[PDB]
Amino acid sequence: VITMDCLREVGDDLLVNIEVSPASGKFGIPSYNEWRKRIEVKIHSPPQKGKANREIIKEFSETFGRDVEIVSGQKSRQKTIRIQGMGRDLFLKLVSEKFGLEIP
């Protein structure tokens, strides 16, 4: 289930560890784990082809309406999505709102 951390609260921005992908129909972005160091997000087929990078800010930003940026290392697909103007509760809120899941 969803009960792990991954989102980092940094100023008016928030950092999350996931793959290069925003979230298709209904913000679909569960919690991430260090073990996997990779989270599974939901998006279109064009995004999961790489566009997910540019689509992230497109969908991600649209999904919630905030700023997003693929951090970490996209080179290996596994990177960190940095959200600007957002926080932890925010990301979680959407997850709890959309994903209906909360991270304690």
From Swiss-Prot:
Belongs to the UPF0235 family. Pfam families: DUF167. SUPFAM superfamilies: YggU-like. Gene3D superfamilies: YggU-like. It comes from Methanothermobacter thermautotrophicus (strain ATCC 29096 / DSM 1053 / JCM 10044 / NBRC 100330 / Delta H). The lineage of its organism: Archaea, Methanobacteriati, Methanobacteriota, Methanomada group, Methanobacteria. InterPro entries: DUF167, YggU-like_sf. HAMAP family: UPF0235. This is UPF0235 protein MTH_637.
